């Protein structure tokens, strides 16, 4: 939906309210979308690690 | 001839306030509180 | 803007029937009562009919009930009368008039009787259409006083209600005044248009009153000139 | 269309208290196990 | 159902100054009733609405009183767009009655009226009737009464008038009055006189002729 990023989606457990579009962590980075065309959440997880 | 029943209403203003609100382990706020609400909050 | 038209009206001879329709234009139909309302020439304002929506509560006057019916045409957008056996009573303009605003609903507007038609005239008489007859009512010394003298022409027994008399094809304007027609017993109308002009003035200049008929086709030219 | 139906019976103005009412989401974003401020 | 009543009922004013017109009803209505205004000749316009509110277009010099009863409607400083025939209206319970109007008339300093007789045309007694024509010119108090007497007999009912609208110039009526006889009952009398009564006239005037006499 316009929002840009990197990383690596997983099928979540959030359940998102009917006016919500995307999940933010406490640092304020997108951790969950909703699928647009599928209704369905998305985990984001970053890529580089250790 | 026009009878009103025995309903209630309740009415309060807003302020500027800052909340400290913590949601759940799901969405859904479960709590909220409200500074400049005595000095312990 | 927000309109209503109507039709239907003109001349009848009595005991017969009649059906005015008016249209609407920029409303919602369904949300308002309509109404039916005459006007007598010469009198006041009267109520006729009154309709709610889907036409269950109707309201006639006291001169009229027995006689005439209303409908509407909520999908149409349209109101009827259904007038019948005419009497000579009847012989009014009339206005469709919307003022209803339908209180179980959310309409817009004003509370009362905001927007009104155009009229339509309807006259009763078993009359048909007659020609006018004129004579000239010369400038007399019994007309005469001091510095001016009037002089006019007389227009009687025609039917067709709009009749026109000029004075020199348009010419004078000082003066000339032609009064209100008069319906008599016969049921025919008349009337009589006179123009005040100097004394000195009798015969020396020209006054020829020009009378046309417009329903009918007559067109006569009558020159007034002082008692022999 | 109008009719006012009042009773001049003034009425002394009641008061309550509100202990913690009135919390909805100033926001439309997601978010678990936090306190936002 | 539910009547009305106008009180005025041919009020006459000059221009720029108050007018009142007071209107009652048979019920009690609460606040619905409309003000209309009618010029000759057109269809009726709404001036006030809910007995004290203006509709859009409407100047700032009517007013609107209302109660139960005793509505009032009020001009003032007047202007010349002013003058027309205005109708109370209740829109309480339907049907929706109407009161009786209120013609509104322009001042006009005492006028006598010209007066003037006109015998029938020789062409009309060939035909075998005869109108006798009575003018009364310019004249700003129409409360004029207009008499036939033929042969000193006062004729009762076989008399027309009609009456102009007031001048836009000078603010004057102009009234004729026509008499209708057969030729048979026309060659039966001598004196055709028209008697006219007015405000401007210290005495009646009387018009006449004399049937045949050139
Ligand atoms: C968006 O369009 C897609 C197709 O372009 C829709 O996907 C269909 O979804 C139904 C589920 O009810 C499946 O049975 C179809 O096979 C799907 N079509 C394809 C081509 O995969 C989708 O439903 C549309 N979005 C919405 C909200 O209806
Ligand atoms: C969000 O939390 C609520 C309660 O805080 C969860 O509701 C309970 O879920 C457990 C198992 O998931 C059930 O055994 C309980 O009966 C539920 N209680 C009620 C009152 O419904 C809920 O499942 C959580 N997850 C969501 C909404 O996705
Ligand atoms: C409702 O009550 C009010 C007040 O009693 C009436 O409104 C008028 O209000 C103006 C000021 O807003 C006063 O100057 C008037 O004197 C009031 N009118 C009267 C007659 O006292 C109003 O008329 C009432 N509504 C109805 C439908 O009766
Ligand atoms: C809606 O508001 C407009 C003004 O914004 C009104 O238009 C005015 O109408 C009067 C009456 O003809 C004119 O004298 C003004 O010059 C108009 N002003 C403008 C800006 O057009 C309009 O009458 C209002 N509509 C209703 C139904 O009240």
């Known amino acids: 939906n316009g929002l840009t990023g990197t990383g690596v989606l997983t099928e979540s457990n959030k359940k998102f309210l009917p006016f919500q579009q995307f999940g933010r962590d406490i640092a304020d980075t997108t951790d969950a979308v909703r699928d647009p065309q599928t209704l369905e959440i998305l985990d984001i997880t970053p890529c580089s690690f250790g | 001839g026009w009878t009103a029943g025995a309903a209630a209403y309740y009415v309060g203003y807003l302020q500027p306030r800052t909340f400290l609100l913590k949601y759940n382990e799901n969405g859904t706020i479960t709590d909220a509180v409200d500074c400049a609400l005595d000095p312990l909050s | 803007e927000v309109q209503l038209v109507e039709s239907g009206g003109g001349l009848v001879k009595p005991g017969r029937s009649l059906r005015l329709s008016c249209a609407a234009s920029?409303?919602?139909?369904?949300?308002?009562?309509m109404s039916w309302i005459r006007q007598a020439p010469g009198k006041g304002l009267e109520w006729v009919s009154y309709?709610?929506?889907?036409?269950?509560?109707?309201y006639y006057a006291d001169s009229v009930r027995g006689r005439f019916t209303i409908s509407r045409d909520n999908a149409k957008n349209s109101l009827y009368l259904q007038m019948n056996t005419l009497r000579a009573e009847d012989t009014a303009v009339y206005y469709c008039?919307?003022?209803?605003?339908?209180?179980?609903?959310?309409?817009?507007?004003?509370?009362?009787?905001?927007?009104w038609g155009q009229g339509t005239t309807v006259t009763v008489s078993s009359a048909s259409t007659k020609g006018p007859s004129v004579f000239p009512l010369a400038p007399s010394s019994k007309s005469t006083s001091g510095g001016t003298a009037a002089l006019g022409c007389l227009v009687k027994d025609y039917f067709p209600e709009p009749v026109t008399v000029s004075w020199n094809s348009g010419a004078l304007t000082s003066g000339v005044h032609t009064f209100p027609a008069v319906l008599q017993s016969s049921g025919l109308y008349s009337l009589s248009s006179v123009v005040t002009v100097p004394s000195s003035s009798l015969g020396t200049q020209t006054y020829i009153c020009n009378v046309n008929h417009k329903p009918s086709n007559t067109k006569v030219d009558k020159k007034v000139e002082p008692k022999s | 269309q109008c009719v006012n139906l009042t009773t001049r019976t003034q009425l002394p103005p009641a008061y309550t208290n509100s202990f913690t009412r009135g919390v909805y989401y100033p926001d439309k974003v997601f978010r678990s196990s936090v306190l936002h401020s | 159902d539910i009547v009305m009543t106008q009180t005025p009922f041919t009020l006459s004013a000059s221009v720029g100054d108050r007018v009142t017109i007071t209107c009652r009803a048979s019920?009690?209505?609460?606040?619905?009733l409309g003000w209309y205004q009618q010029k000759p000749g057109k269809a009726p316009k709404c001036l006030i609405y809910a007995a004290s509110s203006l509709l859009s277009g409407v100047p700032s010099r009517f007013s609107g009183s209302g109660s139960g009863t005793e509505f009032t409607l009020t001009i003032s400083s007047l202007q010349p767009e002013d003058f027309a025939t205005y109708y109370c209206?209740?829109?309480?319970?339907?049907?929706?009655?109407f009161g009786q109007g209120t013609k509104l008339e322009i001042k006009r300093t005492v006028a006598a009226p010209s007066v003037f007789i006109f015998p029938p045309s020789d062409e009309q007694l060939k035909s075998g009737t005869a109108s006798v024509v009575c003018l009364l010119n310019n004249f700003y108090p129409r409360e004029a009464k207009v008499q036939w007497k033929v042969d000193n007999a006062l004729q009762s009912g076989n008399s027309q008038e009609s009456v102009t609208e007031q001048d836009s110039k000078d603010s004057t009526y102009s009234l004729s009055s026509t008499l209708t006889l057969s030729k048979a009952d026309y060659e039966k009398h001598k004196v055709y006189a028209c008697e006219v009564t007015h405000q401007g006239l210290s005495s009646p005037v009387t018009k006449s002729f004399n049937r045949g006499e050139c």
């Open positions: 309709i709610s929506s889907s036409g269950s509560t109707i």
């Open positions: 920029g409303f919602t139909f369904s949300d308002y009562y």
């Open positions: 209206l209740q829109h309480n319970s339907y049907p929706w009655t």
């Open positions: 019920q009690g209505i609460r606040n619905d």
């Open positions: 008039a919307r003022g209803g605003w339908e209180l179980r609903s959310l309409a817009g507007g004003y509370y009362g009787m905001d927007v």
